């Protein structure tokens, strides 16, 4: 929909910052085993532009739809890693500890409309995320 959304659950009662990077063939992600890639340690690191929004204990990292990828989620507490083969999308939190992280699958409803409103009732209608 709006984009590709990665949820980061943390222990802060506030709004931790998140910095997103992307890189291929870092140590342990090479297809033919350790150091079988074209640039040992990892190829070009790209900074990914994110739009962040917050609720208590949950950061929602909205990235452009073009970056959308599958993959294993690794939680290292200081950083979250979205590993898809050779590709890694790295999320670095500031001022909190990552509790759990995941690509948002169950997404919140959207076009909320109040119709047929009377003194005693109203009808709420929406659209799936």
């Amino acid at each position: 929909p709006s984009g590709f959304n990665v949820v980061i659950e943390h222990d802060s009662e506030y709004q931790p910052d998140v910095k997103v990077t992307y890189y291929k063939n870092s140590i342990g992600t090479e297809a033919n085993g350790f150091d079988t890639g074209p640039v040992f340690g990892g190829e070009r690191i790209y900074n990914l532009a994110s739009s962040l929004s917050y609720i208590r204990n949950k950061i929602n990292v909205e990235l452009p739809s073009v970056y959308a990828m599958a993959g294993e989620v690794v939680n290292n507490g200081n950083e979250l890693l979205l590993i898809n083969g050779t590709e890694i999308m790295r999320f670095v939190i500031e001022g909190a500890t990552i509790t759990k992280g995941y690509v948002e699958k169950v997404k919140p409803p959207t076009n909320l409309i109040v119709s047929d409103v009377t003194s005693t009732s109203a009808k709420i209608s929406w659209e799936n995320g």
Partner: protein
């Protein structure tokens, strides 16, 4: 020890890491096994040896004897180090 720098994009990364780990493992003094350590080793703090301690030329570098040959009445000498005398 002279280790070879590990950089992003390097060739022979696995072998250079292996050689460096092997270099460190064979040059370092470890908390187990029998070893031989070369070089002048100066210890800042306290040192205790629970096992058998063994040293070279003890009597020469700790015990010094100075006596007057021609008279035997007065001994005059330049102290080799800081010490306790037994006249």
């Amino acid at each position: 020890a002279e280790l070879t720098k590990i950089t992003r994009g390097m060739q022979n990364g696995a072998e250079t890491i292996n050689d460096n780990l092997n270099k460190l493992n064979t040059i370092t003094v470890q908390k187990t096994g029998d070893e031989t350590i070369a070089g002048k080793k100066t210890f800042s703090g306290d040192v205790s040896v629970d096992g058998d301690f063994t040293m070279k030329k003890f009597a020469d570098s700790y015990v010094a004897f100075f006596a007057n040959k021609g008279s035997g009445n007065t001994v005059t000498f330049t102290a080799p180090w800081d010490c306790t005398a037994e006249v």
